[PDB]
Design a protein around this ligand. Structure first.
Ligand code: A1AQL
Ligand code: FMN
Ligand code: ORO
Ligand code: CL
Ligand code: CL
Ligand code: CL
Length: 366
C-alpha cells in the first residue's frame, strides 16, 4: 500500500501531469477510471469506518467530490478506487459547453487547483440514460453501503433558476440516493446570490416539493452545497432556512474565490475557484460554524483540502458525518483513498473513538 502511495505521489503523478495540460489530464483520468485501469485498492474497510446517515449505510466516510465525474461516466471505477460514496455532476438541464479553454490551472507549489469550468455538462437527458443503464447495479451497491449522489446545476442562460433545479430533481432524483442543490459555484454569474435568504427559501421549497412528489423508492435526500466565502449573515440565514424546511444535509464547502495570503503558484491570480490545501482550514471552520448553527441536527458532508487521515478527522470532529476529496487525487492519484482511510482508522483508535460515528462533532463537546 505505502509502496504504491510513494511511487504515485513522488514519481508517476508528477511525470504524467508534466506531460499533459490539466484539462487533458482530467479527461484521461475519467477514461482510465471508466475502464477500471486502476491500482489495487488494498485497504479493507473495517466496521469502524461505517456511517449511517441520510437514510443510508456508508461503508466508509470518504467520497469523491463533485466535479471529477461531471457526467456520470466513471461511477463504477470510482467505487473500485475505494470511495465509500460517489457524487456526480454538476449536471445542468440542457447540455452546455462551459467556459473557453484554458479553464483549469495547477498550483503544485500550493497543492492547489484553480478552475473555471463553468458547468460544462452533457445535460440531464444524457446523464439520465447513462445512470439508467446501471440503475439496478447501483441499487445493489447502495444496499451494500455504497451510495450515489447527484449534484444539480443550472444553465448559464436560464431565466428561472428554481425551474432548472426542479427539472434536475424530476429527471435525476429517481436515480440518486441524494441530490445536491449546488448554489455555490464561483463560475456562473448570479449563482451564489441563490444562497441569500428569501431566494433560498423559495428555491428550496420548490426543490423539496418536487422531491416529495417522487415515489418512495425513488425519493432522494436533498442537500445544499455552500461556499466557503459566505458572510456570517449568509451562514445564519442558510442555517435558519435549512432547519425551517427540513433540508436533509449540507455539503461544506465548494471552492473559494478568495486568494489566501501566501499562495506561490504562478497562476494564483487566474479567475476561478481555488481548491486543495489552501482551502482546507477555511472549509473546516465553515463546517464548525454550520454544525453549531444547526445544533448538530443537520448532517454535513465536509469537503475542501482533504489529503490525509488527519485532515478527514479534523472535519469529522468539527461536525462532518462524511468527507469528500477531489484535488488531492490530482497530486497523489488513486492510492490517496486507501491512505486517507488507513490514517483515519489509526487516528480514531489513537484518540479513543469506537468508530467514525463517535467522533462526529467531538470538538463541540470539549
Ligand atoms: C482538476 C483536473 N484534474 C487534473 C489536473 O489538475 N488532474 N486530474 C486527475 C488526473 C489523473 C490522472 C492523469 C494524470 C492521467 F490520466 F493523465 F494520467 C491519472 N490518474 C490515474 C493514475 C493511475 C491510474 C489511474 C488513474 C485514473 C488519476 O487518478 C488522476 C486523477 C485526477 F484527479 C484532474 O481531475
Ligand atoms: C476541476 C473542479 C471541478 C469542480 N466542479 C464542481 C461541480 O461541478 N460542482 C460542485 O458542486 N463542485 C465542484 N467542484 C468543487 C469540489 O466538489 C470541491 O467542493 C472542492 O474542490 C473542494 O475539495 P478539494 O479541495 O478536495 O478539491 C469542482 C472542483 C474542481 C477542482
Ligand atoms: O463547473 C465549475 O466551474 C465548477 C462548479 C462548482 O460548483 N465548483 C467549481 O469549483 N467549479
Ligand atoms: Cl496549469
Ligand atoms: Cl426511475
Ligand atoms: Cl475569481
Amino acid at each position: 500500500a505505502t509502496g504504491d502511495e510513494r511511487f504515485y505521489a513522488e514519481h508517476l503523478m508528477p511525470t504524467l501531469q508534466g506531460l499533459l495540460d490539466p484539462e487533458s489530464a482530467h479527461r484521461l483520468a475519467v477514461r482510465f477510471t471508466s475502464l477500471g485501469l486502476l491500482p489495487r485498492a488494498r485497504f479493507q474497510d473495517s466496521d469502524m469506518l461505517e456511517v449511517r446517515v441520510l437514510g443510508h449505510k456508508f461503508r466508509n466516510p470518504v467520497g469523491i467530490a463533485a466535479g471529477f465525474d461531471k457526467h456520470g461516466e466513471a461511477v463504477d471505477g470510482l467505487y473500485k478506487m475505494g470511495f465509500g460514496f460517489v457524487e456526480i455532476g454538476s449536471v445542468t438541464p440542457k447540455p452546455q459547453e462551459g467556459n473557453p479553454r484554458p479553464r483549469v490551472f495547477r498550483l503544485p507549489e500550493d497543492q492547489a487547483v484553480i478552475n473555471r469550468y463553468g458547468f460544462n455538462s452533457h445535460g440531464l437527458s444524457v446523464v439520465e440514460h447513462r445512470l439508467r443503464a446501471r440503475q439496478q447495479k447501483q441499487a445493489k451497491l447502495t444496499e451494500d453501503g455504497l451510495p450515489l449522489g447527484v449534484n444539480l446545476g443550472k444553465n448559464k442562460t436560464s431565466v428561472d433558476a428554481a425551474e432548472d433545479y426542479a427539472e434536475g430533481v424530476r429527471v435525476l432524483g429517481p436515480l440518486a440516493d441524494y441530490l445536491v442543490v449546488n448554489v455555490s459555484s464561483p463560475n456562473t454569474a448570479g449563482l451564489r446570490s441563490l444562497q441569500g435568504k428569501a431566494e433560498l427559501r423559495r428555491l428550496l421549497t420548490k426543490v423539496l416539493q418536487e422531491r416529495d412528489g417522487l415515489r418512495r423508492v425513488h425519493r432522494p435526500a436533498v442537500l445544499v452545497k455552500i461556499a466557503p466565502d459566505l458572510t456570517s449573515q449568509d451562514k445564519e440565514d442558510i442555517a435558519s432556512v435549512v432547519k425551517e424546511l427540513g433540508i436533509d444535509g449540507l455539503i461544506v464547502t465548494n471552492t473559494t474565490v478568495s486568494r489566501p495570503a501566501g499562495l506561490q503558484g504562478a497562476l494564483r491570480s487566474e479567475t476561478g475557484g481555488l481548491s486543495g490545501k489552501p482551502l482546507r482550514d477555511l472549509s473546516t471552520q465553515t463546517i464548525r460554524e454550520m454544525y453549531a448553527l444547526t445544533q448538530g441536527r443537520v448532517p454535513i458532508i465536509g469537503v475542501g483540502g482533504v489529503s490525509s487521515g488527519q485532515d478527514a478527522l479534523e472535519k469529522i470532529r468539527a461536525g462532518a458525518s462524511l468527507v469528500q476529496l477531489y484535488t488531492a487525487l490530482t497530486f497523489w492519484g488513486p492510492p490517496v483513498v486507501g491512505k486517507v482511510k488507513r490514517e483515519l482508522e489509526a487516528l480514531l483508535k489513537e484518540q479513543g473513538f469506537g468508530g467514525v460515528t463517535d467522533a462526529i462533532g467531538a470538538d463541540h463537546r470539549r
